[PDB]
Amino acid sequence: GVDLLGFLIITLNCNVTMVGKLWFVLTMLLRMLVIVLAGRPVYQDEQERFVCNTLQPGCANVCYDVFSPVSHLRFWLIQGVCVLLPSAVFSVYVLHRGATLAALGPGLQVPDFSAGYIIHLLLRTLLEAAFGALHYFLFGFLAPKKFPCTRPPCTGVVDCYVSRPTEKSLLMLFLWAVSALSFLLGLADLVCSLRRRMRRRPG
Amino acid sequence: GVDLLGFLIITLNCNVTMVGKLWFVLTMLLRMLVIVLAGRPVYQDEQERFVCNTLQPGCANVCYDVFSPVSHLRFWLIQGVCVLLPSAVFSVYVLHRGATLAALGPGLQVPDFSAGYIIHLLLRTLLEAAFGALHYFLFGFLAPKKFPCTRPPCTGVVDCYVSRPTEKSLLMLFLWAVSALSFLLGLADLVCSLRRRMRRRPG
Amino acid sequence: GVDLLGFLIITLNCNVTMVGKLWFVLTMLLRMLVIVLAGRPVYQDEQERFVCNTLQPGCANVCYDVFSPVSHLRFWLIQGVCVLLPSAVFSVYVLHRGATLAALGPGLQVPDFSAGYIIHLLLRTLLEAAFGALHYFLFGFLAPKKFPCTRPPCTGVVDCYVSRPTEKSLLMLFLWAVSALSFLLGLADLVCSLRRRMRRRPG
Amino acid sequence: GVDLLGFLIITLNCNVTMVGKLWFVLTMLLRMLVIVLAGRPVYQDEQERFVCNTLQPGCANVCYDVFSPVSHLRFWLIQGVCVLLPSAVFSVYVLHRGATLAALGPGLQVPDFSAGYIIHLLLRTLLEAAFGALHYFLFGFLAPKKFPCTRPPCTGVVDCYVSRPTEKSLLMLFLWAVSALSFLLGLADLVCSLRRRMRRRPG
Amino acid sequence: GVDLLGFLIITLNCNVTMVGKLWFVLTMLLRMLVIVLAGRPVYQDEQERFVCNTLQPGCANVCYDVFSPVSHLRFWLIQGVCVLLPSAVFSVYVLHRGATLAALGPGLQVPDFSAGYIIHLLLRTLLEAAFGALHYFLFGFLAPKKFPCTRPPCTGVVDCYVSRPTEKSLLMLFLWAVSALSFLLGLADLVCSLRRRMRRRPG
Amino acid sequence: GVDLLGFLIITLNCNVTMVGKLWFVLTMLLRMLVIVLAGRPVYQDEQERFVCNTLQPGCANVCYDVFSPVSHLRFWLIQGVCVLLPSAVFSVYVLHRGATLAALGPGLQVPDFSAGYIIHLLLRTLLEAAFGALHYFLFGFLAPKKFPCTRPPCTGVVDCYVSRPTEKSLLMLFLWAVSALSFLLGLADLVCSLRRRMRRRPG
Amino acid sequence: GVDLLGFLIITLNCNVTMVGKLWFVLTMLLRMLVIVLAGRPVYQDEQERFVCNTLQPGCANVCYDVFSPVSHLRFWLIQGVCVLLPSAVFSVYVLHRGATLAALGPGLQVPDFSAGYIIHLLLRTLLEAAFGALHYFLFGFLAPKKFPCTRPPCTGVVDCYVSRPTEKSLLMLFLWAVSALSFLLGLADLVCSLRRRMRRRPG
Amino acid sequence: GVDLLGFLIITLNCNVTMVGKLWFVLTMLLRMLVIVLAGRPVYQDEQERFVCNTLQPGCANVCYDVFSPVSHLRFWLIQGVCVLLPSAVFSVYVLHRGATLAALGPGLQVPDFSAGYIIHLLLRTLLEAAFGALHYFLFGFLAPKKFPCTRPPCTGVVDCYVSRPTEKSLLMLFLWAVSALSFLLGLADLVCSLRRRMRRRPG
Amino acid sequence: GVDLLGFLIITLNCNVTMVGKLWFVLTMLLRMLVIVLAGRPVYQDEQERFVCNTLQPGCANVCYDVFSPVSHLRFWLIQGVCVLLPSAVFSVYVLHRGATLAALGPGLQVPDFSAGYIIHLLLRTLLEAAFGALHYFLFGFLAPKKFPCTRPPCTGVVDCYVSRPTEKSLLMLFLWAVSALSFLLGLADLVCSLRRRMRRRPG
Amino acid sequence: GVDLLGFLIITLNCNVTMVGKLWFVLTMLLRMLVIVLAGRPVYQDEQERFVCNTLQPGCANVCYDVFSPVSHLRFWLIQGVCVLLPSAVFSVYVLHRGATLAALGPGLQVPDFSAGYIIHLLLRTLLEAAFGALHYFLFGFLAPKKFPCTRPPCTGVVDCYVSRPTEKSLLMLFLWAVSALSFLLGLADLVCSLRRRMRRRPG
Numbered sequence A, B, C, D, E, F, G, H, I, J: 001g002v003d004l005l006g007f008l009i010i011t012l013n014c015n016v017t018m019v020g021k022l023w024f025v026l027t028m029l030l031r032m033l034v035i036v037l038a039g040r041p042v043y044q045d046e047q048e049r050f051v052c053n054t055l056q057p058g059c060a061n062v063c064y065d066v067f068s069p070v071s072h073l074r075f076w077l078i079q080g081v082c083v084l085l086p087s088a089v090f091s092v093y094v095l096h097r098g099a100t101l102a103a104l105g106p107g108l109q110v111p112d113f114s115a116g117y118i119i120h121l122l123l124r125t126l127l128e129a130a131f132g133a134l135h136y137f138l139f140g141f142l143a144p145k146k147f148p149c150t151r152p153p154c155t156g157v158v159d160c161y162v163s164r165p166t167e168k169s170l171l172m173l174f175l176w177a178v179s180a181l182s183f184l185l186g187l188a189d190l191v192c193s194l195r196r197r198m199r200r201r202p203g
Helices: A020-031 A032-039 A059-067 A072-084 A084-100 A115-138 A167-185 A187-199 B018-029 B032-039 B058-065 B072-099 B115-138 B167-199 C018-029 C032-039 C059-067 C072-083 C084-100 C115-138 C167-199 D018-029 D032-042 D059-067 D074-084 D085-099 D113-138 D167-199 E018-029 E033-038 E059-067 E072-083 E083-101 E117-137 E167-199 F018-029 F034-041 F059-067 F072-082 F087-101 F115-136 F167-185 F187-199 G018-029 G032-039 G057-068 G072-083 G086-097 G117-139 G167-199 H017-028 H030-037 H059-067 H072-083 H085-101 H114-138 H169-197 I019-028 I030-042 I059-067 I072-083 I086-101 I115-139 I169-201 J018-029 J032-039 J059-067 J072-083 J084-100 J114-138 J165-186 J185-198
Strands: A147-148 A158-161 B146-149 B158-161 C146-149 C158-161 D146-149 D156-160 E145-150 E158-159 F146-150 F158-161 G145-149 G158-161 H146-150 H158-161 I144-148 I159-160 J146-149 J160-162
Touching: A020 A032, A020 A187, A020 E083, A020 F158, A032 A072, A032 A167, A032 E072, A059 A158, A072 A084, A072 A115, A072 B032, A072 J114, A084 A115, A084 B018, A115 A167, A115 A187, A147 I159, A167 A187, A187 H030, B018 B072, B018 B167, B018 G117, B032 B072, B032 B167, B032 J084, B058 B146, B058 B158, B072 B115, B072 C018, B072 C032, B072 H114, B158 I086, C018 C032, C018 F146, C018 G117, C032 C072, C032 G086, C059 C146, C059 I059, C059 J084, C072 C115, C072 D032, C084 D018, C115 C167, C115 G032, C146 D085, C167 J185, D018 D032, D018 D167, D032 D167, D059 D156, D059 H114, D074 D085, D074 D113, D074 E033, D085 D113, D085 E018, D146 F158, E018 E033, E018 E167, E033 E072, E033 E167, E059 E145, E059 E158, E072 E083, E072 E117, E072 G057, E083 E117, E083 E167, E117 J185, E167 I144, F018 G086, F034 F072, F034 F167, F034 G072, F059 F146, F059 F158, F072 F087, F072 H030, F087 F115, F087 H017, F115 F187, G018 G032, G018 G167, G018 I086, G032 G072, G032 I072, G057 G145, G057 G158, G072 I115, G086 G117, G117 G167, G167 I019, H017 H030, H017 H169, H030 H072, H030 H169, H059 H158, H072 H114, H072 J032, H085 H114, H085 J018, H114 H169, H158 I115, I019 I030, I019 I169, I030 I072, I030 I169, I030 J072, I059 I144, I059 I159, I072 I086, I072 I115, I086 I115, I115 I169, I144 J114, J018 J032, J018 J165, J018 J185, J032 J072, J059 J160, J072 J084, J072 J114, J084 J114, J114 J165, J114 J185, J165 J185
Parallel strands: none
Antiparallel strands: A147 A158, B146 B158, C146 C158, D146 D156, E145 E158, F146 F158, G145 G158, H146 H158, I144 I159, J146 J160
């Protein structure tokens, strides 16, 4: 006889490639940790110290609301969460199918979930291009230092100053590089899994 | 002989359907995580930057206390916590009953807790309609931008400005869509479990 | 032969009743989670926006130090932590005794720690009445809206305004109801365990 | 045949006494949790609301930098983290030695790491007296309410007010009592282990 | 027959030395915990209480943006996260290779991953010297107390005061000592593993 | 022989009636003295303490410039000066003609300038009705206490408060009564001089 | 022959008694000069430095408008100007009658205007009692130091401070004494002129 | 015999024409009195209420100094004083010559100072055209309402508001009309004196 | 025959000595003119710019009221007015007696009012010593620069600064010297008039 | 017979030259009038609008007290008053001597006070050079625009701005020119009187 906690691990550590195993480590310690630990402190006083040259109440609220409809900390969070989602559905499906197969019963006999891996890789790859295009079209590459605001109740043209315009642009480049490097890790894995699956098919 | 840590998972991963396994994954990574990580920073300076057009001390406190008796961040937290509660009582009951059955002893012999799943699904479904109706009757769909306040000690009619009226209304739509999508996942599982239980009953 | 990771669970899931397993689930998802996630944001600007009608430096500090000697957020935290303490000593004792009994060796033979459960239930029950009485005698049921302060260096009688006097009183009722409901869960379990232990004793 | 996940627990739950098992439970839920959850909110506006009687820029920074060179929140953190360190080295050593002994192979045969427990107890005991003496010589027992400051660029003698001088002194007593109670738990365990080891040694 | 949850630990607990096991304990409880728990509160009001001697709006933002282009809290976080990265790739590689070796099958037969440990140690050692040199060339050893700023729109020379210049310099020394002590732990392990590998090679 | 300083006085003290002599005394000690000594102090802080409910620079100047285009202190001065002008031309003409008549030479022989007195009385009488009508149509009878102002750059409707609205209205009544009483003094003199001149004309 | 510039002086210097000549000197250098030179500077910042304990605009105006409806500087000026008026009508009547009597012609022959002096003295005496009674009933004897104000838009009871409450009360006593001393100078002259006129009348 | 206080008046009231006697009366009661009594109160807070849109000290001083180098109240004073000067030298010369002629002694014999009157009229006429041209080239006809200021230390372009821009422009027209009317009074007198002097010269 | 306007001047310019004629010229152009023209501008902002180190309303009023109960500008005015009073009573008495003596009639016959001059000189001399002693005992010789104030509602000891402490002390010396010089002018005249009157008295 | 009011003028208008009569006219209408009417308004806010770059109370008073120990308005007043003093003593002496000479009695017989005119001219000339030298050594020719101040309690070097630095320097030039022109009028009169007196002296 054999146990079952073990068999539940060989099945999971036989359908994930080494590249996909290292992608999971790289894009959760350098991507999901920097956003939480180093992103929140930087973007805490974005409105508190967004200083405008006015004294009329309500002008600084309207000017900041026009300046940044949606912050890019929230955009980073949503983009990073929605990429880890295809990797959880497949993990839950593998555990649901593998543990429901040993209950009935019959040099192991690990099932082959290789067709369900290429689809998840394709969806994950397609989910990064759209979020990269939206990121480029929404925020650009570097943060500005000044903002002209003319909305009421402000009279004339008011000038407002952005807080921390340099460090915020230094974190943008780091996150852009991390995302670009992680995008090619799923492209070097798909073109290998596809090339391997057809090879192991005599006919 | 066989172990019983594998038996304690096969029992649990035989009473939960694939739809129910997928609902658990979706409504904790896109619902319970966005509320904590992305909801708290947005609603931090709701009173600090709630600027009113007055100079008399105590008017800004009174006006804000009438503007928002209960914030919708707390409402989101309470609504999301009370939906995961029926899913924990059933999980604890399954573990209490399963491990108390192998102690006495006698191609497995997994117990069938299918009657205790429909009831938990019904309670969970009924707990969402009430919280949706209350949400619609309390906060609406979009956030306002201005507030007229006439309570004492303010003299006349004072105007106050809401902080971040646009991003707050963008997060409401995302959470509304997530809740609406999760409500139909428990409705597509109940009408399948009920239809399956009667099928597997010759008489 | 049999394992011991399994034997270490039946020993633990044979000395805890269903009511005691359900109390553990309820009073950490609705009590220890609301305090941490929904209590900290509410009580963050209690002194920052405790506005008094004065201009002399140091009057607002003195007045606030007399208004609230100890906050009830810390009271809630200490009261909730000290109730989970009797449940941890018993858990650690059960694991210490159970794993030291299978080392020597000889239809299982699970030990009976039923006498050590009633004592922990009694201590837990006695620890709630004292904290309820202290809570009633210290903070009451609802939060006030204004405070008169006459301490030096303030001249005359100064009036100060409490921040968020309505939502703070709405959370008080929720926590009071949760505590009252959890107090009767340990009373319906003790009067059942005591009545069962004497029944299973012919003589 | 037998497993070795259980064998890795008998070894660990045979070298730690009951007093040492309950010390870990007590001085982690009442010491490391109150510091994190109840200490951070109290000491968040120590400088923001350290109000001095001056209008010259830079005087309030200089006065506060002389009032508190190092805060006692960080002192509590460092003192509590350096006491849990001897308990982790011994735990890692026990697992390193135990799992390297069953690989070679030969009513169990649990190894006896009793000599490596008294040394860790002695180091832990010696690490508390020094931190208690430093705590007494640095911060005293109660928090003050006022501070006289004469450093430049302030002219004359300025008076500054401490924020929350009462609650801060109420938390000090609780933490002092917790530390004093935990110090005698390691003294009642050492004088028992030493007395037991010599007893089980005929010669 | 034998399990494989046990075989998955000896494989991991036979390729890591005692020095490497104690290094992991040391520079994660005294390095990654002090940065998070004790570093964030200190560096929270670095810009809020960076007081400059001016009244023109926008001067305090410009002066602070030149004072600190990048904070050293973020530098500490990035430096500490990039050193734990080589230790995770090796860990995941060991688990990927070990569990893929028992599936095929044939006094244990644990594989020897001793060659893949020296390279990871070398990379980890090389990653510390660069970050130490950059730390020296960027921030120095102690924090200043004043800053002269002449950038527009400020007129003349303005003087600004740094918040908490003493405690910030006390945490610098603690972290410098921790890093210096951890650097020699990987140097005492490499020159031992290298000297041992050649010894166990007759030819 | 006789002198001519004396003859220069009988000529002047024979063409002015008793009513016209008392009018000069009354409307120079109660009219031209109250305006200078009691009017200037009252109207000194009319703009300095004209408080509006706004904080935007330039709104208080614009609102005051529309509230009072021309002050009534200046109106009182101009009206009181232009009434004393007809009385000076006649006085200078009498002295020019009288001293140019005794140079050539021949119970005195005082010349009769009775025709040149009725014309000056008529002009003086006609100069009061126009200034009374203008005063009634411009300022009214009493001073207001509040002013609504909506001119730019003020946003919305602003309320401004008039300084000393009661005493300013108490001086208005005194000056109105003085002017009304002085107007009938020139009407009781003209209808007497006209009735006397025709009587002393047999033919 | 004789001149008439001289005859115009004996006529005036034979109808005014020594007491009446001295009264004009006294209550014109110590009464009409102290009011102008020493009264205006004291009452210049009566409203500018009338400090009230409020921040709402418009409260300090309405409070001062109720504190002092009419100032006593204006009252002093009006009272002092209305007493010198009876002394000017008699003076101009004497010159009008005297210069119109020498034109027609016949040890001088100065006319006797003794009957027209008693009536002017009586009117002057009667004009002082009324203004003394009004002064007593309006302003009292000493100036206050504080004022309670409850008029809207002020909230609650506000306390305001009077500027220069001591010097203003020192000038009041000086002016009261001057007026009281001047009142008895016209009473010692009337009871002498009346007693002399009847004496020089044999029949 | 005759006196000479009279002879000193016939001499003076025989060399001044009726037009010249009337000009003297008009341009000191409507010109020299309005400037002093009505011009000083208007131009008292020209700098106090010259509000600029800036917060940097020293900008409001330089902006006002550039706005008005020399005020037109001082210009009015100097222009009006320098026109009365030619009328005083001639008056002093007539008195010096007339009283030095009767000392030596011989139907009066009044001297003829007609040649010294045309020259003074010519100088007075020439002194008005230059001051009118300078007034036109310096201040214009109406007062502005706003001023743009860019001098250092002000940053950018600042806008400042003029106090009382309407009443100040109403006084300008009154003074311009008075000056224009007085200029033609000296032109209607010169062309008459010149035409009369040549007529009374047979040869 | 002779006139009596001249006779009214011989009488007055025969009872006043040359020293008494020059005293009137000196102590009216250098004493009564400097006080009015140069004293009022200096003492105009004595309270407006009496800056105290406090922020509580009402403290600066009571502190200034205690500082200067009576100003020395008013003291100078009252002291200088009360010295010119004895010189006016004698002047009015001389004109009253001289014009009443020529009416009755009989190398002139000027009356001798020499006994009424020594008495007025004695009273004037006695009126200066008292005012000098009071001036010395009240204000001293030089003005202070700082004032400590502890009256309520001020808390502690407040420091206030006097405006223009140097120029005010420069005017004090000038006025002291003028008064001291004028005091000896009336002493050099009395000891000469007394010595002359007894000489012109044979018996 | 002759009068004496006429004799009192020829005596006075025979000892004053035409140049001396013209100097009197010029240096009271262009010197004593511009100082009073045009000098007081300019120097009214010299301290109110003397803006320094500081916030510490008491620094602006100390800095202004060192900037201008004595103002030049008071210097102008004192210098102009002390020059008219020699012209009043001579005038009073001429009237004292002339009216005391006709009382005793004997083509007039006017006395010759020519020796007492040169002495007064010499004293007046000598009183101008000293005040010109002091004026040059004290204030210079033009007014500054900025002032550096380092006196305590000001910290560092403070910059202060002078109010109206341009118009104040324009009035200085006008007054300098007036004084310089008036100084040569007394020099062209003395060198003529001295040359004439010696001519009219045969021996």
